[PDB]
Design a protein around this ligand. Structure first.
Ligand code: K
Ligand code: K
Ligand code: K
Ligand code: MG
Ligand code: MG
Ligand code: MG
Ligand code: MG
Ligand code: MG
Ligand code: MG
Ligand code: MG
Ligand code: MG
Ligand code: MG
Ligand code: MG
Ligand code: MG
Ligand code: MG
Ligand code: MG
Ligand code: MG
Ligand code: MG
Ligand code: MG
Ligand code: MG
Ligand code: MG
Ligand code: MG
Ligand code: MG
Ligand code: MG
Ligand code: MG
Ligand code: MG
Ligand code: MG
Ligand code: MG
Ligand code: MG
Ligand code: MG
Ligand code: MG
Ligand code: MG
Ligand code: MG
Ligand code: MG
Ligand code: MG
Ligand code: MG
Ligand code: MG
Ligand code: MG
Lengths: 23, 116, 96, 208, 86, 137
RNA sequence: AGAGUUAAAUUAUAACUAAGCUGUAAAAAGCCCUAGUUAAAAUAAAAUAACCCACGAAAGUGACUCUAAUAAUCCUGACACACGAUAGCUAGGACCCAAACUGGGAUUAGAUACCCCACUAUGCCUAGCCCUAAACCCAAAUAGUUACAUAACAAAACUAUUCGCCAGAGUACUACUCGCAACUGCCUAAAACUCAAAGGACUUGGCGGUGCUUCACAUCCACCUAGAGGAGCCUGUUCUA
């Protein structure tokens, strides 16, 4: 199902929102 | 009367926004669902409580609780009789409405036509 | 049915009325066609899956000397004839 | 089971056949028993038409049996009835005028009455719910209560008796103790009632 | 709070039985839907869930009341078949 | 025998007197049947409390007090204390929806107290305080 | 969009009675300044009607009353003008109740989670900003046709005028750049490099601590009898040799 793409975009946004916070 | 099904579902020729979003299509099947078994509840509670009153009031001796003890036995037999006969008769008792097996055969003789 | 519109004379209070003038024209050819295939020694089969005239239709074919099948129709009867009936079977030349 | 489904349990009571003319519905029952040509099982070796037998004695005799010694089990049950009879006879002799016509000298009457006082009225069955076991009281059936009384009698006199004291005499003492509602078996019956009354709010868990 | 007391949602027992009177009260609340309403107000349902619940309640009420009509309509066709073994 | 379910309206004059007193003069038995406890209080026509009882005060503790039997025992105890003060009939008002509604009603019946009217006064907000969130058990 | 208004519930608060009250599958913690009944502001939210499908351009709106009021003589159209749930920010006011964060209790190998109790931001009113959503009916606007014709699935197929958008997948609602009352932000949006696939729908099988119904006669539970695990001995493995 299309959830295999929303989850991939979920992780990237969740990791980017920690790269901004850390630096 | 049946609720109106006009301008409810999401269709191309529908200006009104959707009001109903069914999980499965509203197509009548050729069979009805089976009857659901009635969940059980604890029996002989109003008779056990009064029995416990005499036991606590007489040092757990049935020398004066004979009236309560017999009713507890009577309730157990009464509950036993009803529990061991409800299943067989309820299948064909039908409460005025045909059992699921008969309704399935009746519906098969006059099936629904989604196609053509 | 949608294809029966040309054959309908009209509808009377929600009840369709079949145009008998077109029925007479069709029935005249149907009887004429039925007789000719019987004249040439043809096998005629009466098929009717209706449980109110099954006996009457079955008796009708017996008097005419022709065959009738008003019972349940098996799946591979007319198509897979050799297996259902026998090794060499002559298929009916007309079905009513 | 070498007997098929058609075979039925035989009727042994002689009095049921010798006086059938006083009833009509029961006459229809046994006249159709052979008119249906229903096969009858062989008579069991234990049960007999002797008027001196008793069904409660046979069940109690069987449970006392260990291994396959029916002779030894029957011998023990014979001595126990004799031992009870001897003690009651001695007590009758050494009694006053009012005490004489109180003592019971019938061991069968004592044995039947003793077990009817050792039967619990309400039992317990564990019920699993929420990952834990709750002791929920239940209205035990008559057959279970009768069987449970016999097991308690045998369990007590087999375990906490002395090595010197014989089995027939030790069981005789407990029968008299249970006849007067003071034996340890009666204490165990009350203990089961204590636990049942304590968990009187958990009866809602059961679904029958 | 401001209305008179012992007028609304009140029944009176007859001939001295109370189990019968209580069941009459429950049928009053169930028909008016208060019993289910109290069940749903124990916790809070978001408006997203409220509309999704009213789209399943309405759909069931349509299918059930339509299958019910077909059963009644076809109920007369349950007599013994007069053409058995025809 | 024409019997009306609706209560006798105070404005009118209905010749239906229990134990020599009118309808409004009969005491009240408040029943608050929550999901974990059942509290029973009997009050006079002037809203003066007579007796109070609950599953907690009758020895039941923790989860046990929320069961039906606990509410049944509370009904028996409350009636006995009420009957001691000399009350025969009472108008029982049920508050809230819980497992102890049925038991408390018949608890007063078997405790030596007679009921004539049943009222349900469950708190029903008309739109009100926002209740707590859901439980994802 | 303004102005005025309040039925049901809840709370401050007072009287009376009671010793306990809340809470869970089961408990603890918390409370005892508490609970029940009677009397009762403010704030907040709008049972049944609604099995109705109306209004607005969309997001949205369904307690009552009054005032003002819903463009175009009735096509398409942007980066321009105006608007845009909820969360979030700035200043003042309100605070019943709910409640991220935080503290306590419990569960667990751990539980900085699910469950229980307390309370804050905040949800609310006035003025300003932010301009993001599965902003999805995933189906663009205006005129039409039921002809031709079934990839699959779904909400049947198509024609005319016009605008917007789309050129493998990952990298990527990212780097750099322009604008913005934004400054951990929004919009616009690549490449180096890696792979020969990514992706939509369907079919059968297996599985499901998914639901409904039915059933285990040595059998899963309830339940019956005799034994193994404890000791010596016999014998068979592993290890030691
Ligand atoms: K309202
Ligand atoms: K399958
Ligand atoms: K061994
Ligand atoms: Mg990634
Ligand atoms: Mg519209
Ligand atoms: Mg779906
Ligand atoms: Mg008010
Ligand atoms: Mg305003
Ligand atoms: Mg504590
Ligand atoms: Mg208070
Ligand atoms: Mg205040
Ligand atoms: Mg709507
Ligand atoms: Mg417009
Ligand atoms: Mg307009
Ligand atoms: Mg324009
Ligand atoms: Mg906004
Ligand atoms: Mg906001
Ligand atoms: Mg805000
Ligand atoms: Mg800032
Ligand atoms: Mg502020
Ligand atoms: Mg606050
Ligand atoms: Mg709070
Ligand atoms: Mg913690
Ligand atoms: Mg929306
Ligand atoms: Mg879109
Ligand atoms: Mg759109
Ligand atoms: Mg457009
Ligand atoms: Mg327009
Ligand atoms: Mg159009
Ligand atoms: Mg296909
Ligand atoms: Mg292409
Ligand atoms: Mg690329
Ligand atoms: Mg984004
Ligand atoms: Mg960005
Ligand atoms: Mg086994
Ligand atoms: Mg051995
Ligand atoms: Mg060993
Ligand atoms: Mg060994």
């Amino acid at each position: 199902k299309n959830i295999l793409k929303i989850r991939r975009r979920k992780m990237n946004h969740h990791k980017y929102r920690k790269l901004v916070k850390r630096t | 009367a049946t609720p109106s099904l006009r301008g409810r579902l999401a269709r191309l020729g529908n200006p009104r926004r959707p009001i109903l979003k069914p999980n499965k299509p509203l197509i009548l099947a050729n069979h009805v669902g089976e009857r659901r078994r009635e969940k059980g509840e604890a029996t002989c509670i109003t008779e056990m409580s009064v029995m416990m009153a005499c036991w606590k009031q007489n040092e757990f001796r049935d020398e004066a609780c004979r009236k309560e003890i017999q009713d507890f036995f009577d309730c157990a037999s009464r509950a036993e009789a009803a529990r061991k006969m409800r299943s067989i008769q309820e299948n064909l008792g039908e409460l005025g409405s045909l059992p699921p097996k008969k309704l399935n055969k009746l519906l098969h003789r006059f099936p629904n036509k989604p196609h053509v | 049915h949608r294809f029966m519109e040309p054959y309908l004379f009209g509808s009377r209070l929600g009840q369709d009325i079949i145009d008998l003038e077109q029925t007479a024209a069709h029935l005249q050819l149907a009887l004429n066609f039925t007789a000719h295939v019987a004249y040439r020694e043809g096998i005629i089969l009466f098929v009717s899956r209706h449980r109110q005239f099954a006996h009457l239709i079955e008796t009708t074919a017996r008097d005419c000397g022709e065959y009738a099948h008003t019972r349940y129709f098996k799946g591979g009867l007319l198509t897979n004839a050799p297996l259902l009936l026998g090794p060499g079977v002559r298929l009916p030349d007309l079905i009513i | 089971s070498r007997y098929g489904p058609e075979y039925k349990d035989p009727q042994i009571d002689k009095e049921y056949y010798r006086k059938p003319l006083a009833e009509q519905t029961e006459e229809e029952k046994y006249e159709r028993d052979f008119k249906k040509t229903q096969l009858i099982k062989a008579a069991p070796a234990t049960k007999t038409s002797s008027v001196f037998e008793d069904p409660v004695i046979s069940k109690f005799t069987n449970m006392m049996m260990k291994g396959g010694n029916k002779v030894l089990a029957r011998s023990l049950m014979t001595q126990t009835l004799e031992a009870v009879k001897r003690k009651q006879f001695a007590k009758y002799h050494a009694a006053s005028a009012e005490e004489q016509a109180t003592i019971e000298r019938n061991p069968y009457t004592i044995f039947h009455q003793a077990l009817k006082n050792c039967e619990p009225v309400i039992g317990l069955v564990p019920i699993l719910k929420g990952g834990h076991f709750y002791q929920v009281p239940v209205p035990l059936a008559d057959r279970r209560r009768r069987f449970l009384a016999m097991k308690w009698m045998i369990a007590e006199c087999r375990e906490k008796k002395h090595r010197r004291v014989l089995m027939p005499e030790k069981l005789s003492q407990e029968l008299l103790e249970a006849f007067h509602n003071q034996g340890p078996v009666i204490k165990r019956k009350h203990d089961m009632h204590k636990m049942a009354e304590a968990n009187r709010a958990l009866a809602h868990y059961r679904w029958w | 709070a401001n209305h008179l007391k012992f007028i609304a949602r009140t029944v009176m027992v007859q001939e001295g039985n109370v189990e019968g009177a209580y069941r009459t009260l429950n049928r009053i609340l169930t028909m008016d839907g208060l019993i289910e309403d109290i069940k749903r107000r124990r916790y809070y349902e978001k408006p997203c869930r409220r509309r999704q619940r009213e789209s399943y309640e309405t759909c069931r009420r349509i299918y059930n009341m339509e299958m019910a009509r077909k059963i009644n309509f076809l109920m007369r066709k349950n007599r013994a078949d007069p053409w058995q073994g025809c | 025998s024409s019997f009306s379910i609706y209560p006798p309206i105070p404005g009118q004059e209905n010749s239906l007197r229990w134990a020599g007193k009118k309808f409004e003069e009969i005491p009240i038995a408040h029943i608050k049947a929550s999901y974990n406890n059942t509290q029973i209080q009997v009050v006079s026509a002037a809203h003066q409390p007579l007796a109070h009882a609950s599953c907690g005060t009758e020895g039941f503790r923790n989860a046990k007090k929320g069961t039906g039997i606990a509410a049944q025992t509370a009904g028996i105890a409350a009636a006995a204390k009420a009957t001691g003060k000399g009350v025969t009939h009472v108008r029982v008002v049920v508050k809230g929806l819980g497992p102890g509604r049925l038991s408390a009603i018949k608890g007063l019946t078997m405790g030596g107290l007679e009921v004539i009217s049943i009222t349900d006064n469950t708190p029903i907000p008309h739109x009100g305080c926002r209740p707590r969130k859901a439980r994802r058990l």
